[PDB]
Write a protein that binds this DNA or RNA. Sequence first.
DNA 1: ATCAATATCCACCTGCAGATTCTACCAAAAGTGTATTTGGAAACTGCTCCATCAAAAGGCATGTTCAGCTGAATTCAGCTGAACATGCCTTTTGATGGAGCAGTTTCCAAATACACTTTTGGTAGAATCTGCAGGTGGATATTGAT
DNA 2: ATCAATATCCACCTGCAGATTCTACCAAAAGTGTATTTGGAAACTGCTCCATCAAAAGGCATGTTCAGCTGAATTCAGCTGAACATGCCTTTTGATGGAGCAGTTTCCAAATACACTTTTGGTAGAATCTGCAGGTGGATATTGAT
Lengths: 77, 85, 92, 93, 96, 99, 105, 107
Amino acid sequence: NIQGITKPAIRRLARRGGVKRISGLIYEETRGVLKVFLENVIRDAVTYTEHAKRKTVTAMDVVYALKRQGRTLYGFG
Amino acid sequence: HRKVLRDNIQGITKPAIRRLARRGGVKRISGLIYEETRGVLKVFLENVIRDAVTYTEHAKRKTVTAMDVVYALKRQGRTLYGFGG
Amino acid sequence: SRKESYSIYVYKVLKQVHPDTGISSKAMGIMNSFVNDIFERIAGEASRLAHYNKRSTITSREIQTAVRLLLPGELAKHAVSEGTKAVTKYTS
Amino acid sequence: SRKESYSIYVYKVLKQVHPDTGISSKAMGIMNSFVNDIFERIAGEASRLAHYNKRSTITSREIQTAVRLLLPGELAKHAVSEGTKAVTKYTSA
Amino acid sequence: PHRYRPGTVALREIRRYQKSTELLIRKLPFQRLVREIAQDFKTDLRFQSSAVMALQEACEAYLVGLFEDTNLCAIHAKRVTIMPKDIQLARRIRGE
Amino acid sequence: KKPHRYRPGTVALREIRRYQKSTELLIRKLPFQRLVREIAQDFKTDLRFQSSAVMALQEACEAYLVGLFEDTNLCAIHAKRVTIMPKDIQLARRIRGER
Amino acid sequence: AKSRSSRAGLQFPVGRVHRLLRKGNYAERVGAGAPVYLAAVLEYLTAEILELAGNAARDNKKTRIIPRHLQLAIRNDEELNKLLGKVTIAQGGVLPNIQAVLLPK
Amino acid sequence: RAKAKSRSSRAGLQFPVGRVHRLLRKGNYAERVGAGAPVYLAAVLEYLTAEILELAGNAARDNKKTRIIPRHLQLAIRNDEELNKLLGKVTIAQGGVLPNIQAVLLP
DNA sequence: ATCAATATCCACCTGCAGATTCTACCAAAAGTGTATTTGGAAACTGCTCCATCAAAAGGCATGTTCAGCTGAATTCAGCTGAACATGCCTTTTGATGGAGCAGTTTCCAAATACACTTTTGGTAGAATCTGCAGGTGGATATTGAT
DNA sequence: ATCAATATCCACCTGCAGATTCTACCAAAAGTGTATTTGGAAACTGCTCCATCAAAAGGCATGTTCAGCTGAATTCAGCTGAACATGCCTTTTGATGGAGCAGTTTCCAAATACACTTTTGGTAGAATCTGCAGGTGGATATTGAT
Ligand SMILES: [Cl-]
Ligand SMILES: [Cl-]
Ligand SMILES: [Cl-]
Ligand SMILES: [Cl-]
Ligand SMILES: [Mn+2]
Ligand SMILES: [Mn+2]
Ligand SMILES: [Mn+2]
Ligand SMILES: [Mn+2]
Ligand SMILES: [Mn+2]
Ligand SMILES: [Mn+2]
Ligand SMILES: [Mn+2]
Ligand SMILES: [Mn+2]
Ligand SMILES: [Mn+2]
Ligand SMILES: [Mn+2]
Ligand SMILES: [Mn+2]
Ligand SMILES: [Mn+2]
Ligand SMILES: [Mn+2]
C-alpha cells in the first residue's frame, strides 16, 4: 500500500518544500521515510486507544500521539 | 567587589575550540571557525543562564544553584545528568 | 451534549481588533488549539515552579515567572504588562 | 539536614548484577538523575492519561500505558513484564 | 511545437504549490496505508474520519518540512537536485 | 640530518583519537568561570554561584559544542570537504532548528 | 453581579480559567490573581495573532480569516514563529520561498 | 499488632515502594493514587537501573576496572540502540563520546 | 537585446449553495455571602559555603615560520531527469443499509484517604578499606625520509 | 623496503583520596480503624463508521526526446597544520570573613468550604451573506529567431 503514495504526489510535496529537481531514487526513499513516521505516530495513537478501552482511533488519540513526539498539531481538538 | 569582567568570551581560546572539534571528529578547521564558535557559544550560554537566573530570582535567592541550571537546561531540551542532590 | 471551547472569547477579541472581519470554522479550531496549548504550557511551568520551591499554591507570581520563561523577548514584556494591569484592575 | 536519594537501591541492584563491581560517586549521581528523570516521565504521562480519560486515580494501568508510550521496543516489553509480575506478587500478600 | 525548457515548469510548480494549502496525497491510498499500518499494532480498529485527516495533515507537513531541509543540503553541496544522501544527512542532523 | 615532521593531518588524527577516548573538560576552568559571571552579571547584579552550578554549565556547553562540531563535520564532508567552515555550522544550526 | 472577567477588563474568561487551573492537577491551591493574570496573557496573545491574521484576510479580499492567514501571520513574525516553532497549523501551507540559486539565469 | 512487612519485600523489589508512593502522592499527578501504581513504577525503575548497570559493569570490565565511572555509563548507553533512544536528549556529565572517525578522513 | 508568438497567471464577474451569524431556551457553571482554616511571609538565627586573596611552578597559550595539500575554479560529456502526448484505471463521488460502539445513568462492592500510633529502614558522619592514578620502562606499531 | 623517529600499547608498582562499611538516631513507612470516593456491570440508545455497489472524471502510468546538470578530471596559490621559543596565567590548596541559605516560630492575609442565586455559553434552526465554480480579458513571462 506504500506504493499507493505515487511519484507525482511525492513531487507535489517536494515542490511545496521548494525543490526544483528530484533524483529518481528519491521516491522509494520518501516512501521509507513516510512509513517510519506513520508507524511511530500510529503505534502511540493506538496505545492511547487501547488505554481508553475503545475500538475507534479518534482525532484526539492522534493529536496526543503527535504531541508526545514533539509535533503538536493545531485544528483537530 | 571584584575587578570588572570584560571581553571574557575571548577566554574561549583557539586551542580549546580545536580540542572541542577534535572530540567532535573534526580533522581540519577554517580560520573563521573560532570567531563563529564564540558567537554560537555566547548565545547558548546566555540562553541557559537567563533561564537559570529567572529560577533563582523566582526563589528569591541571590545564589544560582546547580539545580537552577539543571532546570534551565531541561526546559531547553538538554537534560543534564549528574548534578542533582 | 455540551462541549466547551474558547470560540466566543476569540470572537470577542477579533471584533475589538478587526470589527468587520470574520473567521472560518477551521480557523477557529486552530485558535482553540492555540489557547489550550499556551494554557497548558504556562500552567505546567507554574506547577513545576511551585513544586521546585515547595509551595502548594499557584499564584500570579508563578504565572509571571512562567511567562518570562516561555515567551520570547518582546512578547514576554507585553504579556507581563497585560497580566499585571489586569490583576491591578481586578484588585481595585 | 537530611537528603534522600536512590543511592542504596542503585547499589543493591548493582551488587545483584555485578557482585564484585563498585561505582564512583559521580556515576552514582548520574544514576540518581536517571531514576528521577524516568520517574517524572512515567508519572507525567500517567497523569495525562488519567486526565484525558477523566479518571481521578493513577493506577497500575496508567503506569503500564505510560511505559508503553515512553520506552522503545524490547525495553518496554521487559519493563511491562517486571511491573506486572511485581503487582501480582504484591497483591497475593 | 511549444516546449518549456527543463526547470521552467518545475519553478511554476513550486510557486503553485507554495501558495495553496490543499492536501497533496490522494485520500483513498493514504486511508488504505493508515489502516494497514494500524493492523500490525492492534486488529479490528475503526477510525474517525477526522483522525485520518489529522494523520494526513501531519505526514504532509512533516514531508514538506523535510524536503525543505533536504533542499538546503543539496544546495550546500553545489547541487540543485535532491538525492537520498541529502535526505539522510537532514534526518541525521534532525536527530531522526 | 633532517628533523622529523609528521604530515599535515597525522597529528590532527592523533588528537581526534586522544580526545574521543578521554572525558576531561576541554575549556580552561577559570576563563569559563569568568565568562559565566560576566554574562550572569548583565542579567542581574550581585549574583553568587554554587561551584557546582558553574561546572554544570561547563558540562552542558562542552557537550553542546562537541555535538555541534559532529553535525558541522557531516555537513562539510557532504560538500566533499574535510575542512569545517562557518557555512557548515550555519547549515547544521539551521537544520537543528536553532536558526 | 459582575463577572470576574469584566472587573479585570478582559474578554477571556477568568472563572473558567480558574476552574481549569483547579482541575488540571497543577497545585493543591490556586490564588485569586493567577487566573486573572493567565486570562490576560492568553487574551493578549490571541489579540496579537488575530491582528496580523485579520490583516492577511483583507489583503486577499476575504471577510473571513482562514488557517492560511493564521499561518502567514505566525510565520512572518519572528517571535510568534519561535513561540510556535514546533506547531503544525492544519491547512496553513508554508511561506512562498524559492532559494535564489534555483532561479533562472 | 502485626509485624511490619515492607511493601518492597511484598513485591519482591529492591526499589522502595513506599517512597515511590509518597512521591506520586505529593507530585500533584492525580487526586488519588492506586495501590498497585507505586509497585509497578518502582519495579520499572529498578528494571531499567539493572539494565544500565549490567552494560556499564561490562564496559568497566572491558577496561579492567572494578569501579563504574560516568564514561562506562556513556559507553553503555550510546552503544545500545534502545537505551540511546530513551536517553537521546540526555547529557551524561564526564561521559565523553564514542570513538568515531568518519572514513573519508583516514589517510 | 530586441520582436513575434505562445502559454500561464491573475483579477474580476455572476449567481447560489452552503457556511457562518443570529436568536431564543435552559442545564450547568460561575458568582455571592458567610463562615472557618491555613500556607507561608516575617522575623529571627545557626552555620554552610561562597568570594577573595595568597603563593609558586609548569602546563599551556601565543605568535611565528614554512610548506603540504586543500579548496577553489574551470572544462565537458555522458547520462539522468524534465517536459509532453497519450490512453487507461484508480480515485472520487454518490447512494443505501445496518452493524457496532460510544455514550449515559444508576448503585454497591471494593477501593483509597487519612488521623493516630508504632516501628524500623535510611541517613549522616565516623571509622575503615582499597582501586587506581600516576609514575616508570620496555615491546610493538605506525609513520615518513630515504 | 628498510632504519630512525616517535607514539602508542601494556604490564608492573604503591599510598592516599575517594569509596565502602559501620553505627546509632529518628523521620517516614507501615499498621489500624473509619470515612469517603469511584470504577464498573447492567441495560440501553442514537450515530458514526464500515460495507457495498455504481459510473465517470481526471489524475497517473507510460514512452519518447533532448536539455542541461552532475561528476570527473585538472591545475594551483595560498591557507592551515606541524613544530617550536617564549613567558604568562591557570591550577591547586588554604585562609578568612561573612553573605546568605536554611531552620524555627508565630500568626494573619488569603485560602478553602458550602448553601444558595444569578448568569452564561452551548445548542439548534432560521435568517444572512460569503466564497467559489467556471468563464473572461488582460498582465506578464517564456521561448525561439535575429
Ligand atoms: Cl494569586
Ligand atoms: Cl493500582
Ligand atoms: Cl544518494
Ligand atoms: Cl563559509
Ligand atoms: Mn550478573
Ligand atoms: Mn463552613
Ligand atoms: Mn501552618
Ligand atoms: Mn604547577
Ligand atoms: Mn605568550
Ligand atoms: Mn580538492
Ligand atoms: Mn549533450
Ligand atoms: Mn535497623
Ligand atoms: Mn595509568
Ligand atoms: Mn521525631
Ligand atoms: Mn546574615
Ligand atoms: Mn449568551
Ligand atoms: Mn476559479
